[PDB]
Amino acid sequence: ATKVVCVLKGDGPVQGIINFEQKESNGPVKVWGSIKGLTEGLHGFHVHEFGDNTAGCTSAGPHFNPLSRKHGGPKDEERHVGDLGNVTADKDGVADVSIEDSVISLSGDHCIIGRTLVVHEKADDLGKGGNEESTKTGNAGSRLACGVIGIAQ
Amino acid sequence: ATKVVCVLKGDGPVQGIINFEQKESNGPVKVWGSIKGLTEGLHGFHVHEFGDNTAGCTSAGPHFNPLSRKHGGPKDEERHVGDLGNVTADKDGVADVSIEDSVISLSGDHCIIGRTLVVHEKADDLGKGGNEESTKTGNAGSRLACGVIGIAQ
Ligand SMILES: *[Se]c1ccccc1C(=O)Nc1cccc(-c2ccc(C(F)(F)F)cc2)c1
Ligand SMILES: *[Se]c1ccccc1C(=O)Nc1cccc(-c2ccc(C(F)(F)F)cc2)c1
Ligand SMILES: [Cl-]
Ligand SMILES: [Cl-]
Ligand SMILES: [Cl-]
Numbered sequence: 001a002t003k004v005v006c007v008l009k010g011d012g013p014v015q016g017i018i019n020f021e022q023k024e025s026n027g028p029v030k031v032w033g034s035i036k037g038l039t040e041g042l043h044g045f046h047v048h049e050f051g052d053n054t055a056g057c058t059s060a061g062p063h064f065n066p067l068s069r070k071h072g073g074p075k076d077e078e079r080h081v082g083d084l085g086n087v088t089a090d091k092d093g094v095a096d097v098s099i100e101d102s103v104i105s106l107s108g109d110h111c112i113i114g115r116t117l118v119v120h121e122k123a124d125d126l127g128k129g130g131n132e133e134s135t136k137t138g139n140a141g142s143r144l145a146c147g148v149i150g151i152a153q
Numbered sequence: 154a155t156k157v158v159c160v161l162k163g164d165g166p167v168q169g170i171i172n173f174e175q176k177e178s179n180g181p182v183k184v185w186g187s188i189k190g191l192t193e194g195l196h197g198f199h200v201h202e203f204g205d206n207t208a209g210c211t212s213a214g215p216h217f218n219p220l221s222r223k224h225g226g227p228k229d230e231e232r233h234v235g236d237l238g239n240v241t242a243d244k245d246g247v248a249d250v251s252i253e254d255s256v257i258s259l260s261g262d263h264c265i266i267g268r269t270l271v272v273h274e275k276a277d278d279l280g281k282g283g284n285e286e287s288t289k290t291g292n293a294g295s296r297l298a299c300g301v302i303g304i305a306q
């Protein structure tokens with residue numbers, strides 16, 4: 001039923017379009033689209049708390065964490081709602097994104113509409129980095145590009 | 154209370170930050186902030202339907218019109234939900250925005266979260282232009298800058 005979209009932009013060359021679709025009121029969310037201008041390899045892919053771009057991607061705040069848990073991979077029970085794991089950029093710097101997630105939603109208390117999607121500088125270590133940062137941010141580093149998650153055609 | 158924000162960006166020099174605050178459900182919404190890089194005078198100020206920036210401000214679609222009415226001024230009964238009227242840019246091209254509106258909301262079926270705020274090339278004629286365009290767009294012309302309306306700190 002409900003279809004949202006997100007246009008990723010930042011200070012650098014990284015830009016993309018990510019779609020979200022949810023058929024059932026609390027069923028799985030299909031996240032798909034393309035990001036380009038990325039370094040080859042893994043990049044952290046998170047929903048951050050605020051749809052606030054007043055001071056670039058920084059204003060988005062931390063990973064959307066309504067249940068006040070520690071950072072993890074999407075398949076971990078201990079995770080932020082916004083912890084969608086990694087996207088993989090090919091040799092040409094293009095990440096063809098396709099994710100199914102059941103913790104995020106386009107309705108309820110886990111709604112990500114009016115919040116920020118961020119693609120990060122490095123791989124998300126999924127909380128296995130053995131430092132304080134790993135259990136907060138997954139050591140994914142700086143925010144290359146972000147966008148507010150909005151209602152789509 | 155509920156507090157949302159919007160960062161207006163486009164292809165040109167027009168850019169701004171607009172805040173929305175609503176103390177009571179079905180109460181008035183305080184819209185305030187600053188826009189710069191505008192021509193001196195009036196500029197159409199509307200919430201458009203989609204939080205979609207896939208092809209710039211064009212992808213936002215028409216004025217948010219859930220009740221399928223004709224375009225009007227904010228004070229008109231016959232108006233789009235998104236019809237917030239005009240903002241006034243001073244000689245230096247800065248519009249100091251301060252609006253109170255009771256038709257828009259940050260909750261319900263009139264919720265503007267995940268939709269687009271647009272500032273337009275010319276004055277909104279408030280539906281008094283006596284042509285088909287007046288009763289659709291208010292003849293405000295091109296979309297100088299837009300942003301998806303997101304949840305704020
Ligand atoms: Se989805 C979302 C994003 C940001 C803020 C709020 C929301 C949201 O829709 N939350 C929400 C909370 C509680 C109830 C509703 C709701 C949705 C649909 C309906 C109805 F009438 F269509 F069935 C009623 C209530 C939405
Ligand atoms: Se604020 C927001 C942003 C995006 C999507 C949905 C919302 C939202 O909060 N919706 C919402 C909140 C509270 C109540 C309703 C609601 C909608 C319809 C009806 C009725 F009467 F039509 F069935 C009742 C309540 C929606
Ligand atoms: Cl975090
Ligand atoms: Cl890992
Ligand atoms: Cl982070």
Ligand SMILES: [Zn+2]
Pocket residue numbers: 046063070071072079080082083136137138
């Ligand atoms: Zn996290």
Ligand SMILES: [Zn+2]
Pocket residue numbers: 199216223224225232233235236289290291
């Ligand atoms: Zn209108």
